[PDB]
Amino acid sequence: IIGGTECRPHARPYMAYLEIVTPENHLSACSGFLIRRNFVMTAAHCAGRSITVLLGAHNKKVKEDTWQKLEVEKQFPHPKYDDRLVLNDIMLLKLKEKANLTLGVGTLPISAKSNSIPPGRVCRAVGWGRTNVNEPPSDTLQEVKMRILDPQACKHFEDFHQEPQLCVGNPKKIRNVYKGDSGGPLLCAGIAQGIASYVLRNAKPPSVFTRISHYRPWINKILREN
């Protein structure tokens, strides 16, 4: 999160820190959020050989009672995900065990198929990514305000599509998401409306987020049969 602020400790109990072993066998990390006791939502480009889920944390370097580290039982990257174009970048992770909805851990309601967000609205991105281009991933959970822009502000991204994606972040500001924030939710009025997908290497906004409402039917099917 760039230009953000540190979140209040355990104020967003649905946030998940993901440690990934990529298919290329590289060690990586992403953000994510719990939408049901045994299902975490995140970005498809965070898929891999194995994945661990850490819930109930604020500072990933400080172990606390609220900590709940769960293994991922099954990965559900969107069937139409395209790594080259980075399209349909959304994934559902079924946990080996159900998380305990006690203190520090809770779920996050997601947007309805026809309850999406209109340009102009100010939402909040939340993740564990880098606080800047050459800065390290933040130990503490961060959050920053970002405005939804008209799809035209993202025409410089040759593979962008307003239907399944969102154009977020006033280009005149530094506020934005970056490496490590993928899978994190974009909230507007306490509801997850998007998922951080990709950004510009120099961190200049806006950025692209997966529009959750567009995949509501697919998400429901997974949660229905699992």
């Binding site: 970048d89 990514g129 990709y198």
Partner: peptide, 4 residues
């Protein structure tokens, strides 16, 4: 672009 770069996928985060």
């Amino acid at each position: 672009a770069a996928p985060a």
